[PDB]
C-alpha cells in the first residue's frame, strides 16, 4: 500500500476576484468580506471532500481518503491523503479525487450564485417598490393640499392670481394663485409623472448590471494547492 | 462487534433553501435584519442544538443509544458529521434518517413560533414609529392653526379682509395676516381637512407595516440544514 | 455520584421582546440589533454561570459548548448525591444565575432610562428657553416698529412682498396690526421645530417603560436538567 499526501487551503484573492466582483454587483455595501468568501468556498470544498472520504470507505473494496488540519492550533491549511495500490496510482488517484470534488463544488457554486442573484434582484425590486409608493404618496399629498387651497380661494373669492406664480408656494399661500389656476393644478399634478430621487435611477441601473452577470465569465476555484500530491512511500 | 454505524454529513442550509425566511426577516426588520450568512449559522445552530438534546436523551436510557454529532474536519465549524450505531445496517440507516427528520420537524415547529414572535416585535416597532410621526405632524399642524387664529385677530383690527400681497414666498406669524381675514377664517373653518405633512420615512414605514401582514408561515419553504451526504448503508460492522 | 445535564442557548426573540422594546424606545435607530441582544444576554449568562462554578469549585458545576467548535448551544452539568437531587440542584443553579443576570440588566436598564430621561428633558428645556427668548426678541422688535409706524403715520399694511418684511422692516405692517400683536402677545404661540415634538414624544414613551410588565430570560432551554438513570 502507498500513501500520497497534499496540502490544500482557501483560494487566493486573485482566484476569487471575479466571484468577489459578482457579490459586489449583487449586494453592494452588504457584500461579504473577501475573507468570508474564501472561508465559505473552502468550507464547501472540505464538505464535499468529507462526503467522498466517507463514501470511499463504505465500499466492498474500501479506499482510505483523509482530511485534517496541517497545523495544530490553526483551521487552515488542510492535509489530504490517499492510500493507493501503486505509487503512480496513489498520487494520480489523490489528484483525480481533489479535481472531482472541485468539479462538484463548481456545480454547487453555479446554483448558489443563481440564488444570490435572485435575492439581490428581490432586494433591489423591493427598494424600487417602496420608492414608488413614497413618490405616489407625495403626489397625492400635493393634490390634497391644492384641493384645500381651492376651498380657501373660493371663500376669499380669489379667481385670478394675486401672486406672479412663485415656484416656492405653500399650503398657506397656494390660494393666492386663484380658483382658476388651482383647478388646473389639480389636473396637471394628477397626470404629472412620479418624481424620483437619483437613488431610484441608480437602483434601476444596479438591477440591469445584475442581469449582465455570467457564471462562465468567472473561473472560480474552491481551493488552492499549498503542496501538490506527493510521490508515495511504501507503508 | 455486533453493531453497525450509519453516517451522514449535514451543514447550514443553502441561500436558496432559506430565501423565504430571509425575505420575512427583511420585511420585519428592514436595515436591522440579520445578514443572510447570520441566518444560515442560526438555523444550523438550532438544528445541532435539538440534535444534541436528542443524543443526550438517547444515552440516558436503560438501553442507551449512541447518536453522535461532531464537526467533520478537525478545527472546522462546518460541516457536521452525524452518526448512529444500530443493530443492523438497514436499521442504523433508517434510524439515523428518522432522527434527522425528527430533529428537523421539532426545529421547524420552533421557527414557526419564533417567526410569530418576530412579526409581533416588528409590528410593535413600526406601529410605535408611525404613532410618534403622526403626533409630530399633528402637533406641527396645530401650531400653524394657532398661528392663523392669532393672525386673524391682527387682520380684524387692521380691517384686512382681502389678501394684501402680490408675491409671497412663505408666511410667518407676523406676515400671515396679509392673507386677509376672509382667507384666514377659511383656513380655521377647514382646519380638520388640512392634510398632515410627513417625511418619506413615514410612507416607507406605513408600507412596511402592510407587508408584515402579508407574511405567511406555511408559504416559507424553510429547513434548518442541508445534506452533504445522506445516511450511509454500512457494508461492514464496527 | 449522579450527573444531571441540561442544554442551554441564547434566548428567543419572544423571550426578550420586552428588553429589546425598551432599548428601541431609549435609543431608536441607535438601538442594538435584536440578534446582538441575544448574543450579549447569553454571553452574560455563561460568564455568571462560570463565576458560580468557580465559587462552587471553592466549596461539580460545568459549562462547555455542546458541539466541539460551535459557540452555541452550551451543555451545563451538576454532579449530585442522587439523580433527583442532581436534577433539582442544576435547575436551581440555572434559575439562580438567571435571577442575577436579570437583576444586573434591570439595574442597567434603569441607568439607561435615567440618562436618556436626563438628556431629553435638558433638550426640551434648552429649546423652550430659546423659543421664549426668540418670541420676546420679536415682541421688543414689534414694540420698536410700532414707535416708527406711529411717527411715519403707517397705520394700514404697506407690504406688496412678504419677502420685504424682516426683523428690521416690521413697521411695514399696520401700526394697527403691530398694536394687535403686542395686545395679543400672551397668546402668540411658541415656535418649536419638529425635533421638539419628537423629543417630547420620546420622553413620554421612555416614562411609559414599566418593569411590572417586562420579564426577560438571559437563556433558553434546549434540554431541561436530565434525571440520570445511571451513576457517572
Ligand atoms: Mg393708511
Ligand atoms: Mg412665538
Numbering used by the authors:
A (entry chain A): 5 to 239
B (entry chain B): 3 to 240
C (entry chain C): 5 to 63, 68 to 240
What do the authors say?
Despite low sequence similarities between PCP1a family proteins, the individual protomers have a comparable three-dimensional architecture, and self-assemble into a bell-shaped quaternary structure. However, different oligomeric sizes have been reported for different PCP1a family proteins. The crystal structure of the periplasmic domain of WzzBSF has recently been shown to form an open trimer, while chimeric hybrid protein variants based on WzzBSF and WzzBST instead formed octameric barrels. Binding analyses reveal positive cooperativity for the interaction of very-short (VS) core-plus-Oag polysaccharide (COPS) with the periplasmic domain of WzzBSF, and a decreased COPS-binding affinity for the A107P mutant. The crystal structure of the mutant protein shows only subtle structural differences near the mutation, compared to the wild-type protein.
The Oag polymer chains are neither all of the same length nor of random length, and fall in a defined range termed the modal distribution. This distribution is regulated by two Wzz proteins in S. flexneri: WzzBSF, which confers an average modal chain-length of 10–17 Oag repeat units (short (S)-type), and WzzpHS2, which confers a very long (VL-type) modal chain-length of > 90 Oag repeat units. The S. flexneri Wzz proteins are members of the PCP1a family and are located in the inner membrane. They contain a hydrophilic periplasmic polypeptide segment, and two trans-membrane (TM) regions at the N- and C-terminal ends.
